[PDB]
Symmetry: D2
């Protein structure tokens, strides 16, 4: 299945926060309506915080991509809703063979405010 | 039900990252075996990143507390596992009456490496 | 926080399946726009299947209630989305003191077809 | 990523419940330590309940397979934990091209009792 693709409510601010747990440099891109709006880059094996940004969801079509030196990683994702209000969309990824799936991570949350 | 309580694997590094979406100052505490090991403090209504830290899970007993000026907030939480390997534990909280449950948020992830 | 409340897409068929893991008779009600549309009743401590039904979501306002002989149980819930398409909404409940939260369970899934 | 694979606690009873939302006959197998312990078979496009069974988790290694006339479907899965106690493991699958991922579904829950 396609992973890293999420439908958000339209025209809604959301936070996205990216991490590495990898020896290799991760490139984590956040696309809104197929346009890259944020890119997070780095490495480190202890939950290196690569950055956190607030973006508008546009039509609501979000796609997260993770790659290492142009090679796409294998993604896994889901979305969970707490209290029928608080949304998290999580992306992990595997750049190698150990299948820890933590190499490049994105966490999205909404609504803000 | 009790919320914000999670059983992690013992003696395992995990990341915890905290956010505010609130006018009021949030105090987000991370307890490992009933001992506060990290405290994140601040306010802001656009997913203000309060900090991110890596901690050892001790016996595995983790509890997240959120309060505003000593008054405990109402918490909501869960844990989700992707690819039978990548764990996220999420905590939201409500300090008021609008029931957005985003006022003080913690996201935990493991394993690292 | 309120638990057992979910916003579904409007005018959409969904499945709801109920279980007991309890010595006491569970009453599990499914409300659509505040109207009870299904009721599941029974006991048994080995995941007794109480029934499964397909309902229309109406406006999308779903609420699950669980009670034992008229006394509301303590509910816990969330919603998770797989492949940006397949939705599950889960409800557990505690009628007593052992805090297994499995006493009366509802699982909702959509879309069908 | 591998999907449909879950690590349960060892020697623990769990429930598994299977559904179809498909024109084609689904075959949903539940393996415990690589041994098929339950098989659910059928079709129907309105959340047809194919069956529900309680099994022992053995070492804890569970794998769900879904196929149509011997052809493996594309699986998606995750696991979620409520109240730090109630576990659900969900599997959806796609046998075709419409990518509804609802064609053959398994829901596992534990602990029972
Ligand atoms: C050296 O091992 C690490 O780095 C590689 C490459 O990034 C990852 O796949 C792996 O999980 C570890 O984090
Ligand atoms: C002024 O409204 C905001 O601040 C209060 C108090 O922190 C929160 O409960 C609320 O959701 C908003 O974020
Ligand atoms: C006798 O113990 C059982 O029944 C009670 C009452 O229903 C439940 O709370 C409990 O978890 C067990 O399933
Ligand atoms: C005819 O369409 C249905 O049946 C096919 C084959 O099973 C599924 O893939 C599809 O989602 C529908 O449920
Ligand atoms: Ca890896
Ligand atoms: Ca790694
Ligand atoms: Ca609030
Ligand atoms: Ca808020
Ligand atoms: Ca109980
Ligand atoms: Ca019980
Ligand atoms: Ca299909
Ligand atoms: Ca289908």
């Amino acid at each position: 299945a396609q992973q890293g693709v999420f439908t958000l409510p339209a025209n809604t601010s959301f936070g996205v926060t990216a991490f590495a747990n990898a020896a290799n440099t991760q490139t984590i891109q956040v696309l809104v309506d197929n346009v890259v709006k944020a890119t997070f880059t780095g490495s480190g094996t202890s939950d290196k915080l690569l950055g956190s940004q607030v973006l508008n969801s546009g039509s609501g079509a979000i796609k997260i991509q993770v790659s290492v030196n142009g090679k796409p990683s294998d993604l896994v994702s889901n979305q969970t809703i707490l209290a029928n209000k608080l949304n998290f969309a999580m992306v992990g990824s595997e750049d190698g063979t150990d299948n820890d799936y933590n190499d490049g991570i994105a966490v999205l949350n909404w609504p803000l405010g």
